[PDB]
Design a protein around this ligand. Structure first.
Ligand SMILES: C[C@H](O)CNCc1ccc2c(c1)OCO2
Length: 165
C-alpha cells in the first residue's frame, strides 16, 4: 500500500513523488490522470502516464473518444489503468492557459468521491496553469474519499506542506 505520505487531513495524504513511479510501486486500484477533454495525453502528468503504458492509454483513449465524444471540463471517465493501476480515472480540471473557468476545479475533484481510494496529482496544477496551493485547498474541501497526492516538484511539495492550513 501507500508509504511515506504526510497526512494533511482525515482523508488527504501527500508525498513528493513521481506519480508514474508511485503507480508502478503501489499498483493502486485507481490512478487519476490530469486529462484534457480530448484525452490527448501529450504532456504533463498525462504525457508521463501514457508514455509509461507504451501508448496503450492513448490507443484506448482514442477509441473512447471516437465512441463517446469529448469529456466535459470538470468531468471524468474510468478507463484501464494498464501497467499502472487497476483503473485510470481521467479527470479534466480547468486549464487556465486555455481560458477555462477555475470554478470548475471543485466539480473536477468531485469525481474522486466515486472511488474509495485514489493515487492522484493536484488537478489543474502544472501545465494546466492553476495555483497548486488553491488546488490542494479545493481537494481537501471537496474530496471525502482517501486521496494520496503525488507532487512531482520537491520545491512545490515543501511550499504546499508549509503553507497548509
Ligand atoms: C489493493 C491492491 O493494491 C490493488 N491492486 C490493483 C492492481 C492490480 C494489478 C495491477 C495494478 C493494480 O497495476 C498494474 O497491475
Amino acid at each position: 500500500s501507500f508509504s511515506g505520505y504526510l497526512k494533511l487531513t482525515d482523508n488527504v495524504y501527500i508525498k513528493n513523488a513521481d506519480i508514474v513511479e508511485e503507480a508502478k510501486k503501489v499498483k493502486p486500484t485507481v490512478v487519476v490522470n490530469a486529462a484534457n477533454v480530448y484525452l490527448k495525453h501529450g504532456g504533463g502528468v498525462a504525457g508521463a502516464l501514457n508514455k509509461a503504458t507504451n501508448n496503450a492509454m492513448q490507443v484506448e483513449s482514442d477509441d473512447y473518444i471516437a465512441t463517446n465524444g469529448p469529456l466535459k471540463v470538470g468531468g471524468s471517465c474510468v478507463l484501464s489503468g494498464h501497467n499502472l493501476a487497476k483503473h485510470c480515472l481521467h479527470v479534466v480540471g480547468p486549464n487556465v492557459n486555455k481560458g477555462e473557468d477555475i470554478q470548475l476545479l471543485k466539480s473536477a475533484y468531485e469525481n474522486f468521491n466515486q472511488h474509495e481510494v485514489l493515487l492522484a496529482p493536484l488537478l489543474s496544477a502544472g501545465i494546466f496553469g492553476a495555483d497548486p496551493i488553491h488546488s490542494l485547498r479545493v481537494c481537501v474541501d471537496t474530496v471525502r474519499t482517501n486521496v494520496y497526492l503525488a507532487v512531482f516538484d520537491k520545491n512545490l511539495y515543501d511550499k504546499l506542506v508549509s503553507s497548509f492550513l
